[PDB]
Amino acid sequence: GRPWSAKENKAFERALAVYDKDTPDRWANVARAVEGRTPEEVKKHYEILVEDIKYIESGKVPF
Protein backbone atom coordinates (compact mmCIF):
# COMPACT_ATOMS: atom_id res chain seq x y z
CA GLY A 1 0.00 0.00 0.00
CA ARG A 2 2.88 2.24 0.96
CA PRO A 3 2.53 5.54 -0.93
CA TRP A 4 -0.42 7.66 0.15
CA SER A 5 -3.31 8.19 -2.21
CA ALA A 6 -5.25 11.39 -2.65
CA LYS A 7 -8.12 9.87 -0.75
CA GLU A 8 -6.02 8.54 2.08
CA ASN A 9 -4.60 11.97 2.49
CA LYS A 10 -8.02 13.73 2.53
CA ALA A 11 -9.11 11.33 5.22
CA PHE A 12 -5.87 12.00 7.08
CA GLU A 13 -6.58 15.74 6.93
CA ARG A 14 -10.11 15.27 8.21
CA ALA A 15 -8.71 13.07 11.00
CA LEU A 16 -6.33 15.89 12.17
CA ALA A 17 -9.36 18.11 12.56
CA VAL A 18 -11.44 15.58 14.56
CA TYR A 19 -8.51 14.54 16.79
CA ASP A 20 -6.67 17.74 17.79
CA LYS A 21 -3.04 18.14 18.92
CA ASP A 22 -4.16 17.66 22.56
CA THR A 23 -5.86 14.27 21.89
CA PRO A 24 -4.02 11.56 23.86
CA ASP A 25 -3.15 8.57 21.66
CA ARG A 26 -3.59 10.92 18.72
CA TRP A 27 -2.01 8.70 16.09
CA ALA A 28 -3.93 5.60 17.14
CA ASN A 29 -7.25 7.51 16.85
CA VAL A 30 -6.26 8.92 13.49
CA ALA A 31 -5.06 5.53 12.19
CA ARG A 32 -8.26 3.81 13.39
CA ALA A 33 -10.24 6.16 11.12
CA VAL A 34 -7.76 5.81 8.20
CA GLU A 35 -8.27 2.36 6.78
CA GLY A 36 -5.11 0.26 6.42
CA ARG A 37 -2.65 2.64 8.03
CA THR A 38 -1.03 1.92 11.36
CA PRO A 39 -0.39 4.50 14.12
CA GLU A 40 3.27 4.75 13.27
CA GLU A 41 2.52 5.12 9.53
CA VAL A 42 0.13 7.97 10.40
CA LYS A 43 2.77 9.59 12.69
CA LYS A 44 5.41 9.49 9.91
CA HIS A 45 2.88 11.16 7.52
CA TYR A 46 2.40 14.01 9.97
CA GLU A 47 6.17 14.42 10.37
CA ILE A 48 6.61 14.65 6.62
CA LEU A 49 3.79 17.29 6.57
CA VAL A 50 5.55 19.33 9.30
CA GLU A 51 8.89 19.10 7.52
CA ASP A 52 7.32 20.12 4.17
CA ILE A 53 5.86 23.25 5.81
CA LYS A 54 9.13 23.97 7.55
CA TYR A 55 10.98 23.73 4.20
CA ILE A 56 8.37 26.11 2.59
CA GLU A 57 8.68 28.63 5.42
CA SER A 58 12.57 28.59 5.77
CA GLY A 59 14.02 27.12 2.52
CA LYS A 60 15.99 24.43 4.34
CA VAL A 61 14.89 20.85 5.12
CA PRO A 62 14.81 20.41 8.92
CA PHE A 63 16.93 17.74 10.51
Coordinates of C-alpha atoms in Angstrom, one line a residue, residues 5 8 17 21 30 33 40 49 51-52 58:
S5 CA -3.3 8.2 -2.2
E8 CA -6.0 8.5 2.1
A17 CA -9.4 18.1 12.6
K21 CA -3.0 18.1 18.9
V30 CA -6.3 8.9 13.5
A33 CA -10.2 6.2 11.1
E40 CA 3.3 4.8 13.3
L49 CA 3.8 17.3 6.6
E51 CA 8.9 19.1 7.5
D52 CA 7.3 20.1 4.2
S58 CA 12.6 28.6 5.8

